Each structure stands twice: as C-alpha cells, then as structure tokens.
Amino acid sequence: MEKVREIVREGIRVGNEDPRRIIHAFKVGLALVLVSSFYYYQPFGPFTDYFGINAMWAVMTVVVVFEFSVGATLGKGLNRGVATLVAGGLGIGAHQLARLSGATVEPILLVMLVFVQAALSTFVRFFPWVKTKFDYGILIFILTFALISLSGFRDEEIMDLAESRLSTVVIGGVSCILISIFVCPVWAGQDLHSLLASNFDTLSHFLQDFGDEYFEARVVEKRKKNLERYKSVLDSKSDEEALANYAEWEPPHGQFRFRHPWKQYVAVGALLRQCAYRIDALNSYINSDFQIPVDIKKKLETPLRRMSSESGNSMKEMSISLKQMIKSSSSDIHVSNSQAACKSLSTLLKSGILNDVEPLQMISLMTTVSMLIDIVNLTEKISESVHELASAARFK
Amino acid sequence: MEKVREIVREGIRVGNEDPRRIIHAFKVGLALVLVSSFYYYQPFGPFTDYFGINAMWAVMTVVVVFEFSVGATLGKGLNRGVATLVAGGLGIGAHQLARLSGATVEPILLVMLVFVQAALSTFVRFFPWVKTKFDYGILIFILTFALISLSGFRDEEIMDLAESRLSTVVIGGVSCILISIFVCPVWAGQDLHSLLASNFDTLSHFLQDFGDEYFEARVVEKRKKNLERYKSVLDSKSDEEALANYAEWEPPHGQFRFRHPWKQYVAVGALLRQCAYRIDALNSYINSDFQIPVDIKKKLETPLRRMSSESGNSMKEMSISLKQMIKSSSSDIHVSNSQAACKSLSTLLKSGILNDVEPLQMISLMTTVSMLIDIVNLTEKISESVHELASAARFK
C-alpha cells in the first residue's frame, strides 16, 4: 500500500515537471497502430510475405527507432537504414562465393568470413571518432551481416530475404520519422537555447543578491535554497554535450539554420562554468561560521557594492537577448562601469585606509576582494564570446 | 591516400592506449561461432524449428548483449531474459480473450490492448528511478509483447512461438555470459579503483611541484603540460557515475565483496573534485603574466613551503594504500604537521612583518595564502572519508 502510494506520487511529480512527457506516450501508440494497420488492409496491391515475418520486423523496428527527441530519430533511422543495405549486399555476394567452393567447405568458409568481419567491426567501435554519432551503425552492420550470411536457408531465397529485410526497415523508419515531425513535435536544439538562457539567469540572481548577505543588511532555509542554486551550472557537463550532438540532424525548422554553430554553445557553457567555479568558492566564505566584525565592512562598502550590482545586470540583460534570439549590446555599458569601479577601488587603495587593522581578520576581507575582481574580468571575456555566437548564426 | 594513413595511425594510438581493446574482438568472434555451431550439429537430440528462425534469433541476441565490460553483460542479459518471459505470458493469455469475443472484433480488440500497454510502458521510461539500471527491460517488454500479440499467425501456434522466442534468448545469453566470465575477463569495479588511485596521484604530483614555480626557484611547453594536468579530475563526472552503476552486477570475483560500497567511491570522487576546484584557481594566478617582485617572496617563504610539501606526501601515501587495497594511517602524521604549520604562520602573523608594503601587490600575495589554508582543511576532511571507505569494505 505504502509502496503503491509512493509510486503514484512520483507520477504527478514527473507529469507536472514537463507537460511534454505525457503526450509522447500517445505518439508511440499511434505509431505501433498505423504500421500494423497497413499490412492487415494490404493496400497498394498484394505482397509476398514468403517467410511470414514482415509484421514482426515492421513492429520491431518501430519500437527501437522512436526516441524522445526529433534529432535522435532521424539519426537512428538513417543508421538502421544504410547499415542493412550495405551489410545485405556484402552478404548475398558472399553466398555466391561459397557455392563455387563446393558443398562441404561452403559452411566452414561462411563462418570464417563472418568471424573476421565481426572482429574488425567491433574493434572500430572503440574509436573516439565513430563513437559520438555512429555507435549504432556498426552494431546494425554486424547484426544484419551475421543474420543474412548465416540464416540457414537455401541459396535460391537469399535475395528475397535481403529484399524483405530492407523493405520492412524502410517502411518502419519512414512512418516513425513522419509522425515525430508532423503531430506536435519536440526539437532538440530548442532545448539547448533555453538551457543556456536559464544558466545565465541563475548566475545573475545569485550575483544580484550578494550585498545583503555579505554586509548583513538583513525563512533561513528558504533563503539558503534560493542562494545555493548554482549547483546546476556546475553539474551540466554531461547534458550540454549530448543535446548538442543530438541537434546536428535537425532540419531547418524555421528560424534555426542548417549550420547553426552548436560548438560555440558548448564554449559559452564552459565560460559560464568558469564563472560558477569561483562563485562556489565565494559562497563557502559566507556559509562558514567564522566572521569578521561588521564595523570594518563599511570602510570599503562603496566599491564592493558597485561591482555586484553592475555584474548582475549584465548577465540578466544577456539572457534576455539570447532568449528572444535578437542581438544587443546593452551589456557594454554595464561592464564598462564595472571596469571604472575597479579603477576607483585601486585609487582608493592608494590612500591605504585599510591600515591599523588586525592582520588575522584582514585575510578574509582581502580574499573577497580578490574573487570579485576576477568575475569582472571573466564577465568581460564572456561578453566577447556571446557577441559572436549571435553573429556567426543569423539572429535577425 | 592521406585519409587512409590517418585512419591507420589512429589504429596504433587506440591499440597501444589499452592492450585489452584488441583482444575483445576475438571474444565477440568466438561467441558468434560457438552459438552457430550448436544448431548445425544439433546435439542433445533433435529439435523443432517450426518457423525456421531459431538461427536468426540466436545470432541476433549474441551481438546485442555482448558489451566491453562484465557488469554490462549480466545486466543486459537478465533484462532481455525476464522481460520476454513476462511479456510472452501476458501475450499468449491476451490471445485467448480475443477468441472468446468472436471473429470480427478479435483483431480490433488486440490492437487496443497493445496500444494501451505500449503507452503506459513508455511513460514509465521517463522516471528517474528506472532509468539508471532498467532502461533496457521496459524496451524489451514493449518489443516482445507487440511481436507476440501481433505476429499474424494462427491461434494454434502462439504457444510454440512464445516457447521458441524464450528458448533462443536464454541460449544466447548463457553462452555470452560464460565466455566473458571464463576466458580472460575484464571487470568493471576493478576499473573504478585504479581510476580513483590515479586521480589521487595526479593531484599529489601538482602539489609536490608548486614551490619551484611560485618562488621562481628555476622545455617550457613540456613543463607546462606536466603542471597543467588536473583537467582529468575536473572532467570525470560522467564516467565515475557509469562505471559505478555498471559495477553492481559483478559477482564476488575474489577479494571484492558482494556489497562493496561504490557510493562512497563517488563521494570521495566529489571531495577530490573540490580540492581540484581550488587548484585551478591557484594555477591561473601562476600562469598570468602580471607578477609581484620576488624579493617579498622570501619574507614568508618558510610557512608556505611547509604546507605544499606535507600536503603532497599525504595524498601520495593514500593512493599507495588505496591501490594495494590495505588500510593505513600514515597520512595522520602529515596532516598533523600541516595543522602545526598553519598555527606557526598565524603566530608569525602576530608580529605584523608584512607591514610597509605596497597594497596593490599585497592583494596577490594574500590570495595565495588563502588558497593554501583551505587545501589543508579540505585534505583533512578527505582523510576521514578514506579512513572509512576502507572499513565498511573489507580491506584486509
């Protein structure tokens, strides 16, 4: 009973997390019905179905080449398609060779060829260039070759077997691709933009709410969760890569172009990760119980404040532009003011106001100043990268 | 020609990277031959092969359930096994129901059941609890149910079809598992230990060679590559998870136990990542062209040096123990001396020797002192975690 309730509760949590995870089941269902309706009503004239396995093969390929995205269906489909053709060709030919050899060695020779081919192909699987986008093609190549070359049938029906396998595969793939590109689609590149924009906004929110915590200007658990929310940015390496890879087979679905540079998206993601690198260091200083007396804080309050405010506005403005997919240069004035703020702080440091203080408490105050200066420089670099990701791609 | 040479050159690079990537192809080959030799010589009496697809199914399942590890074959095998049984059972039964209904609705009713079942199963696929280790079971469940319930055969041969499918699957899985656990095996947990030990050693090497660079005690590209080698530690999140998941199906292969706590391995990996977090910050200070005059460096040389030396020895000693799989407490004396070093530095800071210096160059020197103190504290925490990962598991 309690286990049943826990299972049910996860249902609403997953369903309400994303409304598109409950409409994809109906799509899988409509697939497995449309394909299984063509055969029964056998249109476009009659067929052969010599081995009586057309229905099984058509149904099977529709379940394994239908994935959540629309950039993981074309790719899987194209692999399952080509591989079979090539493997079949090489197969039907091989059977001719063994016939000439005779009637006793013929089975032994066939085994040797399939052994060598399987070993060579599965060694290629370990390469770092065919593993990112071609891990399925090699697997189907081994599968199709071994099935056709060692089916156990007679030599006067191998051509029909090869034709039947190819026909079922292409029929299933065509139906699966059409559905997922007509009735309520889900694109994969469009899930890389929003992810990048959310990362920008999350960092901005933390930066815009730093002066209150650091200067003690002020429930506690709720505010802690709001502050400590940068973990996502630091824990999204394995996901920004995949979605980028999955988004190279997409067609030009409207505004997005054929050659959209997703490589720059990963580069900008790394730069945002570097900003979050130092942010985690800064946050640990605040969380720590040890503290320095608040009185000193006012002495250098003015310079530190300016940095936090201008930094946050720059990030937020960029996420706004990157989202609406329109280029802008509003962040230039904000980063310029931040550079002016650092120069003013340096001029203030000439006066040496920070003298006559305890060196032990000085170490903590000094480290904070260090982190802020890097974030001002790091933001400047990120500004250049974004100012070009919106130029190589058409952001009109 | 040039493309051919590039392809060939990658061959030696991949082959010499790991000698075990060239012996796994022969294993795949021996598999696809042994299975295909049983049928031809039909031992243990004769069989039926009513539909003439036993050879195809046996060959097919051997190519898709053979993976590089030995913790990704049992798992895949067990899934492909159970799923079919359960799905078949539910299938043969469903056919009985439709018969009672009549002879016209019978096909329409069957389609409705398979539609509902497919939609429900593929929604479960999106859960975060059945995706880490059970993403294959659901897929085979949909596959087997849809094939049996919609094969298109007569009602007097469905039982034989279900029996044939189950028999081929179990035969292929048994052969594939036996090979990969008898002739030259490759374990997956054993590839998590060495990875953790290598991470420990890499961090130690950087820490043990910090005083020379920071104090200018001293080709350049070679030394830069030796220093800047911490990227691996920071870029191994997506791999320490997988290998851990793949290593829950392993049997007690000798010293390793049935319930080895790989969760603690991931926790120690996160702690090492936190040490590498701050290490990258420290390295960027060195790389930067801007510098502070070397003269001041000697003033506080003694405290900083001690920290680097003792820190490195502690890491190295641990990797030695963790590798030979024997517990030790040699790192206790090293971290204790580091704590003594920090107290001595604090006592030196009482005297305020660092006065009468330029505040602008002071910021850089001060930040370095900050980073070192955290690494001394962070190392202490890691010592506690390691001192228990070797206790929950049997490290005798």
Residue numbers in the entry:
A (entry chain A), B (entry chain B): 1 to 218, 225 to 402
Manuscript excerpt for this entry:
In plant cells, ALMTs are key plasma and vacuolar membrane-localized anion channels regulating plant responses to the environment. Among the different ion transporters and ion channels localized in the vacuolar membrane, the ion channels of the aluminum-activated malate transporter (ALMT) family play a key role for the transport of chloride and malate during stomata opening/closure. ALMTs are also involved in transporting various anion including chloride, nitrate, fumarate, tartrate, citrate, and malate. Here we report the cryo-EM structures of ALMT9 from Arabidopsis thaliana (AtALMT9), a malate-activated vacuolar anion channel, in plugged and unplugged lipid-bound states.
AtALMT1 shows aluminum-induced activation within minutes and mediates voltage-dependent malate efflux conferring aluminum tolerance. Addition of a detergent LMNG may have introduced artifacts in protein purification. Notably, the purification of GmALMT12/QUAC1 whose structure has fenestration employed LMNG for purification. To check whether lateral fenestrations are artifacts from our purification protocol, we determined the cryo-EM structure of AtALMT1 with the same purification method as with our AtALMT9. AtALMT1 of the clade 1 possesses no fenestration, and the conserved threonine residues apparently stabilize the selectivity filter. T61 directly interacts with R80; T84, T144, and W57 (W120 of AtALMT9) make a hydrophilic pocket for positioning of R165.
